[PDB]
């Protein structure tokens, strides 16, 4: 398993801003219901999931981004 920003059919991450950035429910629902991950939340403007299947495409990210998204 892995963590990351899952990509949709068009290769785009799921955007999240405003309340959907402060409250994790929107991204947690996308992560679990659409991507079958364990959980998720909004990290720096896009839905970040925990426990995605290894084969699920995730968006490119710097090592500092993964560390930041993982530590919260």
How does this structure look, described?
This is Beta-insect excitatory toxin Bj-xtrIT. GO terms for molecular function: sodium channel inhibitor activity; toxin activity. The record marks 30 as: May interact with a positively charged residue of the receptor site. Its main location: secreted. The record marks 15 as: May be involved in voltage sensor trapping upon activation of sodium channel. This protein has one domain: Defensin A-like (2-Layer Sandwich), CATH 3.30.30.10. By secondary structure, it is of the alpha+beta class. It is built from 3 helices and 3 strands, in the order βααββα. It has a 3-stranded antiparallel sheet, sandwiched between helices. The radius of gyration is 11 Å and the shape is globular. A hairpin with a 2-residue loop joins β2 and β3 (46-52).
In short:
Belongs to the long (4 C-C) scorpion toxin superfamily. Sodium channel inhibitor family. Beta subfamily. The protein has 72 residues and is α+β, with helices and mostly antiparallel strands.
